[PDB]
RNA sequence: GUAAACGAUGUCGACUUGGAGGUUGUGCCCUUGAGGCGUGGCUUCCGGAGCUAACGCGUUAAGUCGACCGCCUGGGGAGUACGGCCGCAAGGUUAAAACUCAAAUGAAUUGACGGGGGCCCGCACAAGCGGUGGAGCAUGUGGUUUAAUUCGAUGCAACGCG
């Protein structure tokens with residue numbers, strides 16, 4: 001951080017689908033190294049999402065991700081010893097990472113049944129713009145618009 | 152200061168004209184100096200200027216740069 | 217009313233505010249706006265963005281006169297000095313000549329004290 | 333106002349609302365859920381359904397399409 | 408009638424290598440063209456010998472000499488008290504002692520420090536994940552108690568430690 005840099009950590013793509021976004025989703029939502037316990041959750045969620053949406057891969061994940069991925073966000077960039085937040089332009093690589101974290105947090109909330117169902121409902125809501133995950137995006141947009149004075 | 156400058160199309164080009172009086176004079180006349188702090192400030196400013204020739208004097212080294 | 221054709225803009229900026237006034241060429245004020253009154257109370261009304269907002273807020277609400285040419289006159293050096301002529305030109309105005317008038321004494325009255 | 337439990341995270345299940353009042357159709361589209369903690373104000377002119385929507389969310393005006401939903405522990 | 412009224416350097420005169428400039432006079436000359444060649448007055452910066460405790464001064468000496476004047480004799484007490492003179496007054500000028508200490512003081516050197524500066528680093532901040540601080544129990548430590556609650560470690564670097 002202070003001096004050095006990193007190329008990246010290469011990730012093995014998804015087993016069932018020819019993609020890596022879903023593998024990173026599994027990595028984000030697993031816990032205690034229980035990848036074999038997160039895999040069933042994610043695949044069950046994408047099973048019960050396709051039947052309600054009408055498509056298997058795009059409408060399952062991407063359309064619920066592009067309604068929750070952020071565009072700008074606030075960071076502390078004081079100059080003269082103050083504390084006001086300065087909005088910044090988020091980068092394309094971090095957009096998906098932020099979106100998936102927000103979706104997984106919204107799905108960890110909303111406690112009704114198994115996580116394989118909580119995530120499915122939260123993702124349908126994300127695809128329609130109806131969840132807490134998209135509410136977080138709207139709130140951060142409000143903050144950035146309000147602090148748009150500093151640039 | 153007053154400019155028409157019809158020849159450009161929405162190009163300010165008033166930098167040259169604003170860099171005549173506004174930047175320095177108004178910032179100077181905002182507060183009273185002392186009548187004796189101006190002389191000290193001028194003396195220090197013009198004593199630092201002659202250090203430019205002393206810096207110029209330092210070129211004559213190989214320095215392996 | 218009276219459909220004034222060519223007008224005068226006053227951009228009175230300062231280290232705490234930026235007041236923008238649209239008037240006729242004789243000096244009868246048509247409409248004014250200010251960064252502080254645009255909903256920016258505090259340190260946020262010193263930024264050039266607030267001046268940009270005030271310029272548009274003054275260009276609006278004066279379409280009752282339908283002005284096409286504006287002679288801008290800039291006073292009181294501050295953050296909203298160059299960021300307001302573009303905000304006016306982003307409102308449908310002909311910025312003909314940008315006069316800069318600014319009070320300069322020839323060593324007149326004594327200024328205030330120096331702060332600490 | 334006192335302190336409730338405020339447990340249910342899904343406040344209601346909203347889908348294909350089609351509120352009509354029988355003779356006509358009043359509203360058919362809908363917006364984001366109440367997502368506990370949200371504060372929403374309904375603008376709009378008169379005779380536009382601002383009260384039909386309130387009664388539909390309250391549960392005293394059954395939608396013609398059906399399944400307007402409401403969480404288990406909402407007071 | 409007092410100032411850090413300060414180049415903290417009394418006035419006058421004589422002598423003793425150079426360099427880069429500023430401003431103000433003058434003669435000659437290829438002003439033959441925004442130029443050269445000499446000579447005075449004032450002035451800024453750097454520097455040789457020499458001088459100096461060092462810092463530095465260095466032809467405008469703090470160098471080498473002469474004339475005249477003013478002032479100093481450890482730090483406090485103290486530029487104070489009393490007295491005289493001056494002042495409308497505030498005060499100014501001249502000016503002690505008793506007592507007390509063995510030190511005050513200048514310049515420079517090595518460190519340390521700065522809410523002084525410059526350049527780099529560290530899971531230091533930032534970006535994240537998971538925790539302690541809340542409840543039950545285990546263990547240690549202080550406290551209080553007791554016939555004894557054996558002794559030691561007790562900021563970081565003692566407290567699941569000997």
Ligand SMILES: Nc1ncnc2c1ncn2[C@@H]1O[C@H](COP(=O)(O)OP(=O)(O)OP(=O)(O)O)[C@@H](O)[C@H]1O
Pocket residue numbers: 353358377378379380381382383384385
């Ligand atoms: N009980 C009813 N039966 C039939 N039509 C009704 C009934 N109540 C309301 N409507 C109709 O539904 C429409 C909206 O009525 P509603 O009371 O919801 O209005 P609103 O937009 O909330 O405005 P307001 O401020 O007047 O209450 C109107 O056209 C009205 O005539």
Ligand SMILES: [Mg+2]
Pocket residue numbers: 328
């Ligand atoms: Mg003031």
Ligand SMILES: [Mg+2]
Pocket residue numbers: none
């Ligand atoms: Mg005195």
Ligand SMILES: [Mg+2]
Pocket residue numbers: none
């Ligand atoms: Mg004196």
Ligand SMILES: [Mg+2]
Pocket residue numbers: none
């Ligand atoms: Mg003097």
Ligand SMILES: [Mg+2]
Pocket residue numbers: none
């Ligand atoms: Mg003296």
Ligand SMILES: [Mg+2]
Pocket residue numbers: none
């Ligand atoms: Mg004499």
Ligand SMILES: [Mg+2]
Pocket residue numbers: 465
């Ligand atoms: Mg010298």
Ligand SMILES: [Mg+2]
Pocket residue numbers: none
């Ligand atoms: Mg006295």
Ligand SMILES: [Mg+2]
Pocket residue numbers: none
């Ligand atoms: Mg006396």
Ligand SMILES: [Mg+2]
Pocket residue numbers: none
């Ligand atoms: Mg002294």
Ligand SMILES: [Mg+2]
Pocket residue numbers: none
């Ligand atoms: Mg505990």
Ligand SMILES: [Mg+2]
Pocket residue numbers: none
């Ligand atoms: Mg013990």
Ligand SMILES: [Mg+2]
Pocket residue numbers: none
């Ligand atoms: Mg241990």
Ligand code: NA
Pocket residue numbers: 382383384
């Ligand atoms: Na109503």
